[model samples]
Target: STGSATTTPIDSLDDAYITPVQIGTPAQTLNLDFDTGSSDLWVFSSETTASEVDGQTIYTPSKSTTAKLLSGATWSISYGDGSSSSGDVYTDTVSVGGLTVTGQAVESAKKVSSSFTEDSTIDGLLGLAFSTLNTVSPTQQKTFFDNAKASLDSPVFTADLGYHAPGTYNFGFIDTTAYTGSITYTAVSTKQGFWEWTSTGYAVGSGTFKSTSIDGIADTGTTLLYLPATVVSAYWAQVSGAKSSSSVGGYVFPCSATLPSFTFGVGSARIVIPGDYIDFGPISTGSSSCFGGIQSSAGIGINIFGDVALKAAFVVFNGATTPTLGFASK
Candidate 1:
């Protein structure tokens, strides 16, 4: 069977999407954020401190007959947004949609940073990145996808994200009906444990496409698109009132300002982002200032193609030998 699952983005925030996954014999299910940015399949569980868990449901491995503890194992991770979690490890039968993986590593959180604790709905994070990024100590852990890949007809998954709307994540197979136009394929560098690739260049509005190469990752967990400072400056310059604000830590413009569409070149294919989507929202409640979703990845080294950029296309994360990326318009 081609393992597939449809995930729905929660609310109009467009911050993250959650998919239901089952683990262990009795089928303990949890809502997980399938993040392509990191590698770790962790969940809020019985190991978590009660105070650290807000409204999330915790996984009880003791209740599952098939669950096995990896004694002396531990893990810790910190996200780009500063959110973090650390915990013990266990091996169990895990399933996503219709695909079941035996002996999948599952990290059970014992401590979570305030960012995760305050998030009322995020039960756990299911990392879809390369196994090299897994944070387990004493021994590394493989993700559910890695553990199940050999059984798949094609080791791949597709992410179809929408702005403030429902989207789907398909595994082991591609749904041709999910996107329009031909899927433009590009080579991926997995050395960083991310779907990192080089974009040919970009264009501001209807201007000509530049040949500047951008090295970045397609990160589904991140909310905004982060580009190099020069690229960000060029795009924001087109806006009449846009300026880099020290207080805001990024570019901000008047809510009434007009924004031009930004175009990114992936190989020979171009993905154009609408102006409205670039205008994230007002910077503050009832404030006339607005923030641009595109920001600078100055200290981060690698640029991040977050939801703002990803929602503009249908993305296929291919895991075949010599991994590649395929993008198509939605």
Candidate 2:
């Protein structure tokens, strides 16, 4: 009825958070990126091109008796960062922490992009977004969470991301011991199949709060927090030598520059991201310029409250009849 999983940053930059997942009958455990932005439980497997496989683990379907081909089913997915994978589908006994879903659709990657092959930390991605976003063809399949929600004590999951540290992902119930203050609940928009919500406003460092409604999605898959051009510019202005550089592909500043903290509101609650968190580390090894964790989302169509922002607070992805998002200080 309930489940819990530990997620850890794969690298020093906290580029992504990954958790162990059990697949097939005998259970082939693989570390997967628990992505909240997409809806397709895909994995690197025996079918994947051998040349494309790097140091990552692969799920061998032939070894599991529970694995069954989802005849005529095929899938392909592309990420915002350009990484992609595509292949056939299989129904297997998949378990996330303690929550098990029988006959869960598990996509096996046959073709992988260079980016995915290069990142050995992630074997594949487990999509937690709404099922409507699933990329399966012929007949779309529900996501792992969607399949398990029916039997869960509560149709909900929570993400407690950390800053260059280990985090936890819980399902079925909220862990009261994880947060510091009272949780602030907000309405969610499923129109785009994301955990999209409206932020009340934001403030730079200790400045006054800006009273505006900013629509954004809580995407655990993404690494940086992206706001509107206006908000991003305002935050960068506080730093002495910060500027948007086309060559670097985003806003960057001198590594020695003192960065300001960022604050965002949820209902009446405000979560502050540490100033150091915004300094996303050097653009290159031993470089003096640093890329900002918060960038302009003006070109992306919508703002994204990614890992950079989520690390500042505990987020609950509720799947109740009337879905809502809960935010609390950690």
Candidate 3:
């Protein structure tokens, strides 16, 4: 895919609008998460008595004729922000968009708090991200991709999340037009889920800033960008006090005004993060706290591109014949 126009900003608020999925015999439908940061499919259940879930879809074990819970199976996932969820394993009819996949393996977290149970918009996390970053291990294995691979007309698949709001997980591309231009590919190293490359650097405004370098990994799961504090500060300097320290986790800035534009060069390609992304919150309306995509993750080890950057690039993961990753204009 070449490229496309900017869609609406996606957040957890869109979780409840998730499509349905049907599993094996007696078919049942359940809402699911279309996530790209991790590879696995998880669904909360109505049988779960921990607390009521809002917007998020609940898979009731007793109601489904074909569903069954993995007795004694338990697990947990910890996010970078220290948020965690854990629960038992369950299998049921899973559907997305319109396609149905049976016997889908998934997780059920019972310990979800307000952030996950109350604030969460989606039903469940649909991990379309990376196979290496998969929450499901080789032993306790099975992913939506792995199951749907045979049914796919083409070998290619794209995770289109910018549409219908955030967390739109579109799979199996008949063509790239569903997103952008022809997909560009890079070979993957089976061991590491990361798609690594040395930066040729970035360009500030219209001038080349190759000397200033930033290195990190890209994650679609996160919404904010995490860069070195020094690098983020220099970028903020170009925007005046538009970017400043906040009591919150990272820097806050104005999403209004003719903000400076920057381009990140990856080999022969350079992806742009326009002013709109920088000033997401917008100013003049009393809500001047626009989130400057980049946050200070000093002492957090390596940097990360996160969601802000991935939205601009079309990525593809080919794990069947030759496990390779690809990125291009989107």
Candidate 4:
């Protein structure tokens, strides 16, 4: 089966993208973040404490005839940004775009951290990561993509993210018309539940491309592009008044600086991130300082190609025997 859905940007030019998803028998809809960094389909529900939920919509499983409790099952998850949620489990019909799966494990949140409660725009998270990373206890649950893989025309999905504009996520097939130039395919290593890949090299502006390889995960849920400390420093060196700020917790530069474009290699192909994308807007209102979108991946361990980097191109997530990623200019 095949399905397609349009994703809308949440705030500014880059923060998060939310897509509408349907759950349960009669189809209760929720706006969910389609995250490729984690595995678990969770939603704000009746299980959540009233005081903990702000203006977010809640899912009432009892109202759905197809909803069934997964006896003694539970799920909990925490993200890099410190967002956390946990709750009981219910098996129900989950639908995305036009694709539907019956008896899918849907986690109903009973507890949520401030990070989740404050984000009233998102109803929940629909993980697109590998099934191995699923957080359900006793019996692990498969992601919506995993459950529907067999019925899909092709074991693949595409993420076409646009800056401050609507994007599209296509499942089971690729739309050649959505991107420009030939797609460049890269071998991906998913031993860590993420779409992990190594870049052959990278460069700043019109400078010579370096051959140093950088290992990182393509995470759509993340907001900034994170790399090694040395790599982050190199990029900032080219900026006139750029330096690490204790208050900002990242490199900040004068908004008037002429930022340089960054490019990364995938096999023989090169993808360029425009100079403006790295500026990431101002650090604060009425301030001439701006935060750099590319930062050090210190405590995070692995590097991340977040939305800032991924939005520059159309990405194809191919879930074959050996999963691969295809990149093309948008």
Candidate 4 per-residue C-alpha lDDT over 1-330 given as tens digits, one digit per residue, 9 for 90 to 100 = 999999999887568999999998788999999998999999999999888899888789999999999999999899987789999999999888998889999999999999788989889999998999999998999999889888899999899987888899889999999999999998899899999999888898899998898999888888889998988898999999899998888999998987999898888888899988887778888899988989999989999999888989999999988899899987
Candidates sorted on lDDT, descending: 2, 4, 1, 3
Best by TM-score: 2
Clashes of 3: 18
Provide C-alpha RMSD values for all models, in order: 1.3, 0.7, 4.6, 1.1
What lDDT tens digits, residue by residue, belong to model 1 across residues 1-330?
A: 467776777655677888899988899989899999999999999999998988998899999999999999999999997789999999999999889999999999999999888887788999999999999998998988888889887899889987778788888898899888899999999988999998889998988889888989999988889999999999998898899999988899999987898899888999998887787777888999998989999988889999889989999999998999999987
Looking at candidate 4, the ten consecutive residues that score lowest on lDDT are 7-16
Q: Extract clashing residue pairs from model 1.
A: none
Best by lDDT: 2
User: Candidate 4 at 3: error in angstroms?
Assistant: 0.7
Task: Give the better candidate number (1 or 2) by TM-score.
Answer: 2
* Model 4 C-alpha RMSD to native: 1.1
